[PDB]
Design a protein around this ligand. Structure first.
Ligand SMILES: CNC(=O)c1ccncc1NC(=O)c1nc(C2CC2)ccc1Nc1cncnc1
Ligand SMILES: [Mg+2]
Ligand SMILES: [Zn+2]
Length: 313
């Protein structure tokens, strides 16, 4: 109860910045995450005996994939933590509790394949969920772990606070289905231009949290160039594996995934930052001004990829 976590000075300072890397030491990530809950939400809002067990069950149910892994979970939670702490008043005590849990669980039991690959493979999970396949799987795994004994971190909420918090987490996890991002950004844009946006409209908050979630989920692109560059490798390791699996199914895959089209990557990154990342953070900064560091860091990296093409690295 009087048992706050501390961190090495460098981590204590660097953790409050959007562009924080959580480092190569697996065994501190749980301490980092707990620390984020305790500053973001209070020393009280989760019983330590129960949080720590939830964290360790969630670690266990991520897999050893190059990108969609436990380290990705915690990066995404960190980024959400930075947004909450720079947007201190805008969000309820419940939103704070649910969104960090949402982020930690957002990719539970991911195998490193797209919704598309399950559909073309005819994987059972595509039968049981037609759209946002992995995302309904991830929310489903999250509820399963919450029902293990000594794992209900929410035990002390009222029935209705409980239903609110699980409903936050579910929409939050679903929003990480980038297929849904595009229209969710379009609608939020139109509501901020035409000034109709209202953060007491619960359908409006929903969209906003949805964008926050896209932003956190993509936040490897808002890191210092050396981190972005090296995470790009991890994401492509998965893509090229999927491309290989597409070919096995006798389907020439999209070039993003053809490991014989490695040359076309830097142009592909350009396309992506232009089509997706820049738009995401632009609209996010438009809505939540204190998140600009994300847009600035995104732009730097876009520029770093322009320099790649021009032969300058
Ligand atoms: C939707 N279009 C495309 O996904 C795209 C197209 C052409 N090339 C690349 C593309 N996607 C990505 O690069 C990418 N995608 C994603 C999710 C799967 C969708 C997440 C992070 C990414 N980048 C990244 C991350 N961390 C460090 N460096 C880079
Ligand atoms: Mg995902
Ligand atoms: Zn993710």
């Amino acid at each position: 109860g009087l048992m706050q976590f501390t961190l090495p000075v460098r981590l204590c300072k660097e953790i409050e910045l959007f562009h924080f890397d959580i480092g190569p030491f697996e065994n501190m990530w749980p301490g980092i995450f707990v620390y984020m809950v305790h500053r973001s939400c209070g020393t009280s809002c989760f019983e330590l005996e129960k949080l720590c067990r939830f964290i360790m069950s969630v670690k266990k149910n991520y897999r050893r994939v190059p990108y969609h892994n436990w380290k990705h979970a915690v990066t995404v939670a960190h980024c959400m933590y930075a947004i909450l702490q720079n947007n201190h008043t805008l969000f309820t005590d419940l939103e704070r509790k649910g969104l960090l849990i949402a982020c930690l669980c957002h990719d539970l039991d991911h195998r490193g394949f797209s919704n598309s690959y399950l559909q073309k493979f005819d994987h059972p999970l595509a039968a049981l969920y037609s759209t946002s396949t992995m995302e309904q799987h991830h929310f489903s795994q999250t509820v399963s772990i919450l029902q293990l004994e000594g794992h209900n971190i929410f035990s002390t909420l009222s029935s209705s606070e409980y239903e609110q918090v699980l409903e936050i987490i579910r929409k939050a996890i679903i929003a990480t289905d980038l297929a849904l991002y595009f229209g969710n950004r379009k609608q939020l844009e139109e509501m901020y231009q035409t000034g109709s946006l209202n953060l007491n409209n619960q359908s409006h908050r929903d969209r906003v949290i949805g964008l926050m979630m896209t932003a956190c989920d993509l936040c490897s692109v808002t890191k210092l160039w050396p981190v972005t560059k090296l995470t790009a490798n991890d994401i492509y390791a998965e893509f090229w594996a999927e491309g290989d699996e597409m070919k096995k199914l006798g389907i020439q895959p999209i070039p993003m995934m053809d490991r014989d089209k490695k040359d076309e990557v830097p142009q592909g990154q350009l396309g992506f930052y232009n089509a997706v990342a820049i738009p995401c953070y632009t609209t996010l900064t438009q809505i939540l001004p204190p998140t600009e560091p994300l847009l600035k860091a995104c732009r730097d990296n876009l520029s770093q990829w322009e320099k790649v093409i021009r032969g300058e690295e």
